[PDB]
Design a binder for this molecule. Structure first.
Ligand SMILES: Nc1ncnc2c1ncn2[C@@H]1O[C@H](COP(=O)(O)OP(=O)(O)OP(O)(O)=S)[C@@H](O)[C@H]1O
Ligand SMILES: Nc1ncnc2c1ncn2[C@@H]1O[C@H](COP(=O)(O)OP(=O)(O)OP(O)(O)=S)[C@@H](O)[C@H]1O
Ligand SMILES: [Mg+2]
Ligand SMILES: [Mg+2]
Lengths: 376, 493
């Protein structure tokens, strides 16, 4: 069971290149003061939830008195239910009525009756809440509203932000950016040198290895993942698949998966294009759609079939053969036929045609067929 | 008492509780063992579906009569296989390495409709239940979430928490309950559960929160769920889901490719292994065939007919359901020939061949619009002819109706020589009688507008002015050209 004990997908443990950087943004967690004005904002999969498990797992165990429970910004949707879920501290009788109006009714609850104690909540996936109200109206309004740090008594009620992928970071406004609270610190957490990260996950071991993964294949895996944004959860589902395709024989085999899932999504632009088409009637029609693009952008299948009897007019053929042979070009993954608005003059639905790949390699695909050269 | 502004007299509310699983005990350290609980995981009162069973059974009467082709039309219904092995093995290994390792994986299958993905996934779950009965693994509670079998796309929470827990809440209480049960409850008190997300692209609604939660409960260490979500397009999280949820779904992405003609021939061979070339004891009096007056009859479901039915359906979309539909229509055609030729009626050998299955292969390759516009009325063909010859003058495909009217009047006035059109141009404008003035429109004009509007040949835009209401040919112009050339009168008119 040494192959099953190689679990790389969900595990107990930036621990890769920024260990001093994560261990120097946890300052005032024992002095009962305000620590850091940081905003964790990075690519989706770098390890923000990973560091923010350990940063509280240091301060969970025998509790100076700290009571802290983590929740998420999931069942909110609208800016309506932010404050009720964090109110399971002393399970009070109040909470529904007095609290959800105003900041001074939560400033009423910032002073601690039961000693200084501690209660710092970490609202998780906080960019998911602020993506409503369509300009700023009650979500970006709430983000410029709940980052006020105005009165600072002896009260431990800080809240670090858990922002998601860089979808709407670079969109700002002067209310969000002018000296109120926890703004001016944001860090990209991209795990470069993830080879050493995998070495830490395997050396933190409970199942002794004999033949380790080859670091040439490990560095090839770390090369062929971090070009897009550098997702680590994406790379964690690659070596697991490599040892899963190793078990299908009952670095030499941890490569054909990426050389398998890159080629599978890619397939062949022109080599398999005609190969799969093998049929000429499944070949020249793609040229008919190519000629039905530089005259009209509302390429109806009729327009793909009025182009058909403006090319072959030199055993009959009905429209059903054309629209079912187009399903082959649908099945392979080139063409899109669905109902759209059909702007035109009247606005009722009809079929469309669209193509995806750029006309560079397909123009080299016709260099072997002598009948698809005059149609270009 | 009060006078109300409106009424809601026809309202029906369920009996569903509002407080979630987080407020049962309010003690995380004292959660009882959820596995061997009486209500949880379907351990009590599992007759909750079989209440309506003795409603659709009536009389066990009157001696139903099977025929020689009723057997094949029963074996060609919904029900090792030499079709999916490199997908079955990878899926069962990827779902077994999490059952044995208490893990939280997510498998992603996809394919165009018919490639057997839900069949192989349900057989994977049946085999894992057999392994659980053999007790080489722990057991699980199996939940199938069909994306289209629910009236609200947020009822996935309700049915999942109901299947897990035996209690039914509202959808908000169910999503908070499932969030707590998948975050905080430790892995000693929960047995694992496998979730089939059937037809995933119907729960992407307005927030992507359901797609968030079902793929973000599996990133937790403390949640033992395996999501084996199926789909209908391979690049779905690149089209309609976020890139973070693409990173959640990951890199497995095992595609169920289309079938081949050899695989489809093997499929129909296994479907008819028990019936092909066998012997039946029919009776001359009725036709009631019985497999091993009385006539011993063979049954040659011919391999050439099978492969010529299989090559076309292997080309177009490659579906192991459409192959069964073709080979069931062939048996239906055979049974109809047999019953009509013998006078049998409901209460030599028999064959299915190439020039007998070609009708089942041609029943779905016929455009019955040409044979519709030929049998159309003369005024409707004249309408279509006026629309067709306005197009060469205009070049818009969207001619007005006042133009069609004047073009019809132009054709009728410019053909004053033909005996047919001088016989018909009296009735066309005055219904063949006097005491009726010459109408501006021809008789049956709104009728032949509506008879093509409802049929989808014609396509008129909505407006109040029936001189400038535009009109488009929704089908085509080439097939209208090939349908207007067999009239013997419109070919010259
Ligand atoms: N240094 C690390 N060591 C071990 N596992 C890690 C490490 N960094 C990340 N992970 C794993 O990868 C996951 C990534 O965590 P997340 O921060 O949630 O990813 P993400 O890109 O931030 O997604 P978001 O926050 O929803 S945009 C963690 O939950 C761990 O399972
Ligand atoms: N290899 C096979 N062996 C037997 N039956 C098959 C096979 N492949 C497909 N089928 C038929 O397909 C049905 C199973 O449904 P599937 O086609 O696997 O579901 P699907 O591919 O997701 O189709 P949709 O789009 O979800 S309705 C069964 O009832 C079979 O009759
Ligand atoms: Mg996270
Ligand atoms: Mg299905």
């Amino acid at each position: 069971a040494l192959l099953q004990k190689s679990s790389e997908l969900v595990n107990l443990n930036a621990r890769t290149a920024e260990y001093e950087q994560v261990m120097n943004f946890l300052a005032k967690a024992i002095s009962e003061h305000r620590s850091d004005s940081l905003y964790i904002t990075g690519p989706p999969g770098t390890g923000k939830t990973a560091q923010l498990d350990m940063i509280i797992r240091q301060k969970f165990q025998s509790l100076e008195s700290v009571a802290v429970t983590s929740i998420n910004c999931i069942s909110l949707g609208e800016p309506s239910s932010i404050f009720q879920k964090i109110f399971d501290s002393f399970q009070d009788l109040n909470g529904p009525t007095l609290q959800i109006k105003n900041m001074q009714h939560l400033q009423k609850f910032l002073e601690p009756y039961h000693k200084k104690t501690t209660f710092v909540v970490v609202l998780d996936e906080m960019d998911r809440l602020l993506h409503a109200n369509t300009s700023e109206t009650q979500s970006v309004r709430t983000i410029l509203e709940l980052f006020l740090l105005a009165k600072l008594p002896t009260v431990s009620f800080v809240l670090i932000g858990m922002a998601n992928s860089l979808d709407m970071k670079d969109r700002f406004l002067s209310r969000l950016n002018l000296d109120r609270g926890l703004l001016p610190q944001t860090i990209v957490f991209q795990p470069y040198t993830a080879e050493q990260m995998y070495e830490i996950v395997i050396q933190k071991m409970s199942s002794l290895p004999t033949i380790i993964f080859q670091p040439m294949a490990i560095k090839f895996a770390a090369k062929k993942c971090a070009g897009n944004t550098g997702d680590l959860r994406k790379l964690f589902d690659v070596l697991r698949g490599s040892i899963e395709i190793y078990e299908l024989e009952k670095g030499k085999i941890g490569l054909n998966y990426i050389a398998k899932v890159f080629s599978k999504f890619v397939n062949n632009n022109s080599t398999r294009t005609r190969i799969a088409k093998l049929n000429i009637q499944q070949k020249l029609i793609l040229c008919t759609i190519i000629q039905s693009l530089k005259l009209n952008s509302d390429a109806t299948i009729d327009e793909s079939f009025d182009h058909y009897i403006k090319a072959i007019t030199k055993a009959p053929l009905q429209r059903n053969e054309f629209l079912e042979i187009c399903t082959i070009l649908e099945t392979c993954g080139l063409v899109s036929i669905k109902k759209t608005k059909c702007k035109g003059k009247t606005k009722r639905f009809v079929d469309k045609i669209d193509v995806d790949l750029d006309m560079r390699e397909f123009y080299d695909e016709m260099t072997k067929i002598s009948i698809l050269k005059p149609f270009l | 008492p009060v006078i109300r502004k409106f009424t809601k007299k026809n309202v029906a509310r369920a009996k569903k509780k509002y407080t979630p699983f987080s407020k049962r005990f309010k003690s995380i350290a004292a959660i009882p063992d959820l596995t061997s609980l009486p209500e949880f995981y379907g351990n009590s009162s599992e007759l909750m579906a079989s209440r309506f069973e003795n409603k659709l059974k009536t009389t066990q009467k009157h001696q139903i009569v099977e025929t020689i082709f009723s057997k094949v039309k029963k074996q060609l219904n919904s029900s090792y296989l030499p079709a999916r092995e490199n997908e079955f093995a990878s899926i069962y290994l990827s779902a077994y390495s999490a059952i044995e390792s208490d893990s939280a994986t997510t498998i992603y299958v996809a394919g165009t409709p018919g490639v057997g993905k839900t069949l192989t996934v349900r057989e994977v779950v049946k085999e894992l239940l057999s392994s659980s009965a053999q007790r080489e693994i722990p057991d699980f509670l199996y939940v199938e979430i069909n994306g289209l079998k629910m009236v609200k796309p947020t009822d996935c929470y309700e049915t999942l928490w109901n299947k897990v827990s035996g209690e039914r809440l509202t959808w908000a209480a169910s999503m908070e309950s499932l969030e707590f049960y998948f975050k905080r409850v430790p892995k000693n008190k929960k047995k694992t559960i496998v979730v089939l997300l059937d037809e995933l692209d119907a729960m992407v609604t307005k927030s992507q929160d359901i797609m968030y939660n079902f793929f973000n409960w599996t990133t937790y260490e403390n949640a033992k769920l395996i999501v084996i979500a199926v789909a209908n397009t391979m690049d779905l999280p690149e089209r309609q889901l976020g890139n973070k949820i693409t990173s959640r779904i990951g890199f497995t992405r095992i595609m169920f490719t289309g079938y081949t003609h050899e695989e489809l021939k093997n499929i129909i061979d296994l479907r008819l292994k028990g019936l092909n070339d066998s012997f039946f004891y029919v009776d001359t009096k009725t036709g009631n065939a019985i497999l091993i007056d009385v006539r011993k009859v063979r049954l040659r479901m011919s391999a050439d007919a099978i492969e010529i039915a299989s090559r076309k359906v292997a080309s177009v979309s490659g579906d192991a359901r459409r192959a069964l539909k073709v080979c069931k229509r062939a048996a239906e055609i055979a049974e109809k020939h047999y019953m009509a030729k013998h006078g049998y009626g409901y209460d030599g050998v028999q064959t299915v061949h190439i020039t007998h299955v070609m009708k089942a292969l041609n029943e779905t390759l016929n455009s019955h619009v040409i044979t519709f516009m030929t049998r159309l009325s003369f005024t409707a063909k004249l309408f279509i002819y006026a629309l067709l010859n306005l197009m060469k003058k205009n070049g818009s495909q969207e001619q007005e109706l006042g133009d069609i009217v004047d073009e019809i009047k132009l054709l009728i006035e410019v053909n004053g020589s033909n005996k047919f059109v001088m016989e018909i141009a009296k009735t066309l404008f005055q219904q063949g009688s006097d005491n009726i003035s010459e109408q501006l429109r021809i008789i049956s004009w709104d009728f032949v507008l509506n008879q093509l509007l409802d049929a989808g040949i014609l396509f008129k835009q909505t407006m109040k002015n029936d001189r400038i209401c535009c009109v488009k040919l929704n089908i085509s112009v080439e097939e209208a050209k090939r349908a207007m050339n067999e009239d013997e009168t419109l070919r010259n008119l």
